[PDB]
Symmetry: C3
Subunit: 365 residues, 3 copies
């Protein structure tokens, strides 16, 4: 379905060396017009083996990075300082546009998987990367000027610079000592960084809204943390035990991008035929990206212990309506005399029915 | 025949309809002509039910801002943890957020309910979908959409039962005064206090009209008067002009105006500059009940009442909008210009001008 | 290879400009649509740049436009009178001044000066169709036609309350041309200029932060000022007018022989126009990952758009001065690649450096510490 992007069908390898890879999922709207309100958005997948580093670079696009697995040290250099942040799994952080930064995986046995929602600033849904370093894959951007102008600004004869400023591509392994070094400075998300409009925040920290023996629903919102406010986006980490299932529901106005972080699952989407109804389903493996419109009912059935993260675009004052179950049940709030009219079934017929499934949010399937 | 003229007769598309009512969409503002692309996101909808009827539960992926043109109605919005009932009357306007389930009832015995809605789609610009929950011979419950399997597992029932219980012709169905009285005694209405409420309906004409004189009345509610409007940056105005009278040539400062004729007729004249030196151009149109006519921002226009008229306006992009009149003693712009310039800009003595601009003593509404 | 005519960011005055009106007294030219010249910049479609110049002792006749404006008086003075429905404001502007004329606002410009022309740059922001507006003229001249003339004689009779002939004789003047003026820019005597010349308000150090009055760019001090150049910048966080627009304004002076060290904007798309001089500028961007060099030779009246995050350097071939409009300026940051202060590369942890470029901590702890000048340097 236009809403299912196969991690093997819709990714573009930006980089991959014996230390990792970097891919850019196609442009939502480029693939299908139905997702025209996602044009200025791109999903990026970053992975770096243990003991490596992303080389200093900056891009004309905002980044909301999320740490799915492993660890990492995110460092942002400013024109007057620099901040090294300690990012644990589930930790999130906003990396402004045109901000130079490097990534270090200070681990020895755990790979690092990280997803980033990209908000380009010049051309919609299209952005570039500007790497400072000079390598066999990329030429630093400094080398785009003339020897004379570089000569002048740096105060040195070109020769002296082209020898000091102009190593395998952009992902290189540091060394425990190197590693250890560039680390202590690092701050770290905490039990007191939800509101801080700069510090890193972890979604999987506060008690999850929908938690029940067959799964859990983690989410933080624009009204909760300022970084998300500026973007008007909510984030949700959902754990669903194999067998269990997410009761049918829909988002009031927020457009959702979900990315299976691990496991496999099933999804049903019911949108009107372009009056007949229509479904869109797909099995979801690891790394696939599914996008659920707004007010389009969907279900996620976990065919094996699963957890996926979801980006909620257009999330302010969003409301999640559950069609089945007890808590947050919408049809269950529709006056009886109307449930009567609404469906072909005795007023009670509907009622008693509605109160069979006695579990909230996640039921066993 | 001008680009800013959508005729009720061929600009609308009936969506659903039976002996009970009728719902229709006006075409896309942009599909008509590019000149109106800053309105691509907006869609106008008209809804009219006969007395004693209802709209089966449904939600649409579009932010709706509704206004009651005539008749009474009861609007109920259902939340995942609550329900709210509102008793609207003519002039009442509320904002149903997107993805909100709601049913509407016509509690009257002889007067039709004619409502007008402004659609603000959340997914595709200019195009939204109506997801109806009920199950009628005109639509398919958006639950039918799921799998025999999920439906069983979610509800904890054996499909062929829910298929019996959950899955009437049309969506606008007749109800009974009994049922009416039921779904009608727990509804709240738009007092004089809701005018600034962020959830309750607010009545337009409940407040003193901004402009008003012998031949007309100009009711308006802006984005700084109501939080709902402010979060859409839309302003609302309902104006009446007795037959014969006319709304003095004027023009909005920054708001694009969408105006629908409610009851009556009146011919309009909108001047603009040619398009491709300074070639002024006049688009005139003979309007009537239900016609739509947008007036871009900064374009002078005159509405000429040809029979007791009252249109309703949707003023897009209206924060700090300003309406300047090119006639009348009040809010006249041509008359705040310095004498040394209006004598220069006009082929007449800076005394010939003053003596012209001061002959019309009536303001806003004059007598054609 | 490099691009100099195939360099879309550069907008030659000689041809990327369209005249809207022109007669002995003045000229009004509308610069090309940025996205029309190249898809590269489709996030600037909502904008247009307009240039206006008027001879000494001239006046732009009464008119309202289908769009917002942010004028920046470069040289000469003027009086800008905004007329509302129940009021009117007369402003006195001098070089460096900037005022915001909201959409649908009628106003007329005057050049009180007897020996110097007024050169005004303007950023238009159309309200209806994107990247395109229209000018509505109240005045009736041999050139234009009052917009009041688009109505039918019957309505103008009704609305104004007079036999149409009377309206014709005092407002339009059709068929009595001699009684008309020719064009939207007319000339004046000194008494006229006087009668208009003063109910005016002017910029001041205390107008930096005002929602209505003109603020002087060069008034308050420069952000970067050194023996070889000066950088004046007034950001949204300082002035409301610029806040509701989310734009940053700046004026820089770079002496002949000096150059503005290679730097890049954090998130602001910058539209830079040359007000006086000849410059030589290089822009750097990616093409998989090939550093493409964009270069051009800019002189008076030249527009050059440099995308956000793209590093660039301006070279002063002659005493130069340009005016920059920084779009989406909220919180934007300026990152200097070369220089002592606000040098980004120099804040990188010693180690990352070593790995970044083919060198060594100290062989780099020094390379960059060689140029002991900041922001601006001699060539």
């Amino acid at each position: 379905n236009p809403f299912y992007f196969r991690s093997s069908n819709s990714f573009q390898t930006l980089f991959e060396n014996q230390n990792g890879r970097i891919r850019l999922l196609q442009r939502f709207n480029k693939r299908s017009p139905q997702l025209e309100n996602l044009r200025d958005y791109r999903i990026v997948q970053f992975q770096s083996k243990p003991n490596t580093i992303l080389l200093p670079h900056h891009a004309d696009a905002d980044f909301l990075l999320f740490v799915l697995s492993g660890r990492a040290i995110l460092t942002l250099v400013n024109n007057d300082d620099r901040d090294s942040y300690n990012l644990h799994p589930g930790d999130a952080q906003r990396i402004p546009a045109g901000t130079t930064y490097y990534l270090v995986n200070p681990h020895d046995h755990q790979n690092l998987k990280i997803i980033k929602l990209a908000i380009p600033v010049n051309k919609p849904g299209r952005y570039d990367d500007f790497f400072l370093s000079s390598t066999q894959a990329q030429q630093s951007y400094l080398q785009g000027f003339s020897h004379n102008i570089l000569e002048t600004s740096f105060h040195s004869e070109f020769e002296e610079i082209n020898r000091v400023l102009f190593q395998e591509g952009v992902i290189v392994e540091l060394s425990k000592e190197q590693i250890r070094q560039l680390s202590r400075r690092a701050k770290s998300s905490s039990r007191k960084t939800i509101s801080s409009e700069d510090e890193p925040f972890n979604l999987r920290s506060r008690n999850p809204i929908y938690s029940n023996n067959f799964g859990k629903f983690f989410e933080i919102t624009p009204e909760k943390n300022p970084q998300l406010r500026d973007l008007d986006i909510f984030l949700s980490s959902v754990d669903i035990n194999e067998g269990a299932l997410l009761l049918p529901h829909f988002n009031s106005k927020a457009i959702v991008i979900l990315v299976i972080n691990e496991g496999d699952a099933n999804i049903e989407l019911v949108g009107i035929k372009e009056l007949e109804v229509q479904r869109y389903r797909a099995e979801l493996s690891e790394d696939d990206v599914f996008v659920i419109p707004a007010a389009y009912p969907f279900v996620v059935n976990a065919t094996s212990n699963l957890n996926f993260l979801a980006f909620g675009i257009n999330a302010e004052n969003n409301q999640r309506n559950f069609l089945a179950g007890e808590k947050d049940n919408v049809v269950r709030q529709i006056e009886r005399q109307v449930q009567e009219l609404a469906f072909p079934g005795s007023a009670q017929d509907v009622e008693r029915l509605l109160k069979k499934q006695r579990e909230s949010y996640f039921v066993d399937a």
